[PDB]
Design a binder for this molecule. Structure first.
Ligand code: FE
Ligand code: FE
Ligand code: FE
Ligand code: FE
Ligand code: FE
Ligand code: FE
Lengths: 172, 172, 172, 172, 172, 172
């Protein structure tokens, strides 16, 4: 074993490698949304800015899980990063609704990982997930729900001034 | 009697204890409106800010009446603070119309208290109500009437951009 | 259900609404103690200052629980705020001993709420209670015990200089 | 066609989408090298810093090609990002020699893309590749050759002080 | 019982007194290592500085456990501090390997204490150990493993320039 | 012998190792007094501050004797640090009287060590004890005698305001 390794089960080492690939895939989906809003037939620059910011945040989450795996004396194994489900994201409203669905699937995976660390009696790993990951997911899910509510009430997508004025006043 | 007590009738001491409970109840109604606009299915953050500010102002009015009762040598007696009439406030327009009705009922109670101090020949108590309470109620009632007029003219609640743009330009 | 709701049981939503009413009641008891020390027949101004500070801290605790209920997608329901047990608090020593009893009853309710979140497997709710509530209650209970010990040793209430010199040197 | 499109052949649009996937793959290989030097059985922190810097530079190259494709009125199509050839990189010398081989394969692909733009008479695309890509590759290839020369002369890998003192004096 | 005591079992009070003696013993072992590197026949001043810093950190850990025992209303009982296993520590490499073994034995004792607080349902005591002790031990164990790896690769102890150049470049 | 050793007798080397253990024991007794005044049933915070300061001063005296032993080319040998005589120190007056007795026993040991260095003709060792130790002990003994005199005249321990007002005005 590694000279530093203590109280660190092989099931937890394997589950951390699965979470690293999921954060890298989330970063790639947000990059694809950012490219779509910069097309000349779409042209919404504060929507493009917003999704490029989310893409860089998800890469930082991934690089912080790699640091934890080396600190406990586990070994990192990388896999393929699969392509997104779509190339064309249809509208400002539909992109926000797709992002809300993604963030809820990442939160479900983190809750399953906390349950495994609890069953293996790893208190350091439980505290790391609570402190750096769970409170950030709850904050992101609430912001995306508030954006979907306002866009639906203004009459997006059919009311043509709706996505233009939301790009200026909320995302500006 | 208290060693400080002079020209202070027992009817006025009892009427001051009734006004203290009414300001505490007004503060609780504005807190309930502030919580409603922060729901994920409502999401109007400048409406939530506005009503939380009114809730803190009404508590200051209450604490200033307690100071007056101790200065004249009367004795404070507290009662229950009853719950608001509603949990769901329906829209931005309906909440402003409920607040206009509340502020007019607080003003009516203050006018009845000035009439009692006039009949008992208490000039210090008449001047305190004129200086700190009557000119603040007239200013608050006029502001709420101007907000109701603008929201009705923009087409709230059915015109979906109306409450969104009023939250940005008047309450911002 | 709310579009944001995930891993949030209806028993926990109901227990959070009970804790909100208990913090609002604690805030009202400290306001009643602050009024008592400002009477002309009592006249202890640093005792009055101390309890008005505790009353404002307990309102902030309440408003922070309302924010958590809206973030997880639950619904806030308000009740009556009942009046305190007393209008006259007898002395500086007796008021500190009543406050020590109140803070221990609020801590017991928070420990029962952490036990319920543990049984329902809600790690986000467990961490919120640990981080913002449990370490503040332990710190408040120790300060109140140290004030009761010093006042009893100086000979309060019968030694008339005791509460006067404690108001100047500890609460000043 | 797009309303902005002028002098932009479909073969060049397809070749730009192939270069975008190659820069994203280069960024992933440098991230895998950075993780290796942070293991407790390797522990070379200025080697880890150096490769994390190269990984972030290659992502910026990719995001700048996406901007060019939208400016000329072409359409971006993403593919899978394949995993690196290795998980264990053996030594400081072997990692520098693998990086020199990678940078020469990226330069060969850029030279083939300039030849295609020359044959299609696209002067704007020729100038973009010359100005932002060709002079950066020649500078990177020369730096990596100088690092390999010094490490071989000091006696790496078998002379144990060689990689330690190069980490302190050249990469510090 | 103490007037402040709530939810605090006598087994946990006894286990906290055992951890206080273990941190005081760790502080004494690091002081003995610091004296050894200041001998005229050893003369390594950055090694002496490094171990004197660790000795002062372990005393702060002890004094913070005493504060917790008084806050929960338990009673402190002191024992003898036993002498270290050695007076002569042989080399820079052997001292780092002895320190790595000590830090892993302190971490094992803290994990046994978290398991006891979990079984007694003491959430305040669980959070204190997680927040102030577990993340500091994991960070210290990883640093000591990286120092042992570099010293072995440079050829310590037999390669006479190895401990001299590590004292200048890593501990400087 | 050590290459630096000159005019340094083996009896003096052995007497310096005995004085090192006595300063470490004095530091441990003052730490036990500091913990006692922070109990919730005692609660005297300027008494707790005062004794924690004395505990840190006695550790500095010990670390300065270790430096002298290495400078003259002698060898340090550590022993057990025995536990204090008491866990409960009864009052502010009784703790000051115990500290006065301790400081006089440390001074007696230093006078016996100066007499031995005089008999062995070691002028450097005589000057070190005069310059750094003898004038500090005479100053500490006089301060403790003045504190005992004032506490006895104010009526401590039975006059309950005595230790409270001395904590505020002399130790503040
Ligand atoms: Fe994430
Ligand atoms: Fe008012
Ligand atoms: Fe509270
Ligand atoms: Fe490149
Ligand atoms: Fe420690
Ligand atoms: Fe001393």
């Amino acid at each position: 074993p590694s000279q530093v390794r203590q109280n660190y089960h092989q099931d937890a080492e394997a589950a951390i490698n699965r979470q690293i690939n999921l954060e890298l895939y989330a970063s790639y989906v947000y990059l694809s949304m950012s490219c779509y809003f910069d097309r000349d037939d779409v042209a919404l620059k504060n929507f493009a800015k917003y999704f490029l910011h989310q893409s860089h945040e998800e890469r930082e989450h991934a690089e912080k899980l790699m640091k934890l795996q080396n600190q406990r004396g586990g070994r990192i194994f990388l896999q393929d990063i699969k392509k997104p489900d779509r190339d064309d994201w249809e509208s400002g409203l539909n992109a926000m609704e797709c992002a809300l669905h993604l963030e809820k699937s990442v939160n479900q995976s983190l809750l399953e990982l906390h349950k495994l660390a609890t069953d293996k009696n790893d208190p350091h790993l439980c505290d790391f997930i609570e402190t750096y990951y769970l409170s950030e997911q709850v904050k992101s899910i609430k912001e995306l729900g508030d954006h979907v509510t306002n866009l639906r009430k203004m009459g997006a997508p059919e009311a043509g001034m709706a996505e233009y004025l939301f790009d200026k006043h909320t995302l500006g």
